[PDB]
Each structure stands twice: as structure tokens, then as C-alpha cells.
Design a binder for these strands. Structure first.
Ligand SMILES: *O[C@H]1[C@@H](O)[C@H](n2cnc3c(=O)[nH]c(N)nc32)O[C@@H]1COP(=O)(O)OP(=O)(O)OP(=O)(O)O
Length: 125
RNA sequence: GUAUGGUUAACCCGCAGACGAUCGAAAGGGAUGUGGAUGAAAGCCUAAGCC
């Protein structure tokens, strides 16, 4: 298990995280790739950040969970980084994706934002 | 004199790429860049370069 994964995410909740990227890709604006994601977080324009769990080395995305907590931006973990790139609409894999405007997925992001709040309180005791 | 340029183009497999393609000195920026296989007839036009 990676060290940058602060909390475990169930499969069913992670599957909706890909759907949010899929919907917001067509009905909103997302940013695919770790560089675009990092900029979207430090600029404070990212509604939800999605981080992959199969990132090696960790030093590529290990700074997002700390940065997202400072900027008070929710984040959720996805197992596959290739499926993450597929949901963003690119041929290659993606280590992280940032959702700027959810669009039609506005409701789905709210549901994920609540559960990542509850999952974060449980792992923190 | 000469096509490696045209009239005249497709269709296959591969390689690199959101761990950042193209562009840029960098900053920036964000999805293409490319190697090969068979085709690209005949005739005709042009002659940069080369001889
Ligand atoms: O048939 C051509 C050719 O034999 C000869 N010619 C002119 N330049 C070259 C060259 O660089 N390399 C070769 N191998 N042959 C060349 O000239 C013939 C054409 O006749 P012209 O001389 O009338 O026309 P051109 O424009 O070639 O030369 P010119 O008109 O200045 O004299």
C-alpha cells in the first residue's frame, strides 16, 4: 500500500469518481495530467481532484493530498491510472485529474465530497 | 541533363507521449509527434538543389 494514500476508498465509491470525470469531460471542464492538476489546485479552481493508487515513484503525486488539504479541496483515490486516463479521454494513462467545472456531474461531485469527508474522519479516528 | 517537387492518394502495422506530444531561448502551455510496409500508373509540367 502506498504511503500517500491517507485513507482507503471502497470500490463502488471509486467507480463513481471515474463517472464524474467522464460526465464533466463532456459537460464541463476538467484538467488531465499531474501538471495541469497541480496548477488547478494552487490556483484554487479545482472542484475535485482524483489521484491514482498505482503511481510509482510516489514523488510524482505525493504532494497532492497535502496540497489539497491546505487549499481545502477534496480528493479521492482511484486504483487504476490507465482507467483514469481513459475517463479523461486520452490514449495514455493519467496519474491525476482535476475537475474544474463538473457540469452535469454537479450532483455526483457533491455525493463524492460528502463521502470523502466521512471516510477521512474515520481513518483519523 | 536531373524529382528528391508536382498533376495525384490512399491503406496497413509499429515507436515516443498527461511520469507532458506540438511550439518556445525560457516562462508558458496541453495532444499529438514519427518510422516502416505495399501503393503513389502512363503521359505531361516545373528545375530549387544536384550533376
Ligand atoms: O538539354 C539541356 C542540357 O543538356 C543542357 N544543360 C544546361 N544546364 C545543365 C546542367 O546544369 N546539367 C546538365 N547535365 N545539363 C545542362 O542544356 C540543355 C537545354 O538547352 P538550353 O541551353 O537552350 O537551355 P538551358 O536553360 O539548360 O541553358 P541556357 O538556355 O542558359 O543556355
Amino acid at each position: 500500500k502506498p504511503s500517500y494514500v491517507k485513507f482507503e476508498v471502497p470500490k463502488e465509491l471509486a467507480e463513481k469518481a471515474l463517472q464524474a470525470v467522464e460526465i464533466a469531460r463532456d459537460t464541463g471542464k476538467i484538467r488531465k495530467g499531474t501538471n495541469e492538476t497541480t496548477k488547478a489546485v494552487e490556483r484554487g479552481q479545482a472542484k475535485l481532484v482524483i489521484i491514482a493508487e498505482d503511481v510509482d515513484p510516489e514523488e510524482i503525486v505525493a504532494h497532492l493530498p497535502p496540497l489539497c488539504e491546505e487549499k481545502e479541496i477534496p480528493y479521492i483515490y482511484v486504483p487504476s491510472k490507465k482507467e483514469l486516463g481513459a475517463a479523461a479521454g486520452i490514449e495514455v494513462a493519467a496519474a491525476s485529474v482535476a475537475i474544474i467545472e463538473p457540469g452535469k456531474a454537479r450532483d455526483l461531485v457533491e455525493e463524492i465530497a460528502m463521502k470523502v469527508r466521512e471516510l477521512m474522519k474515520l481513518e483519523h479516528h
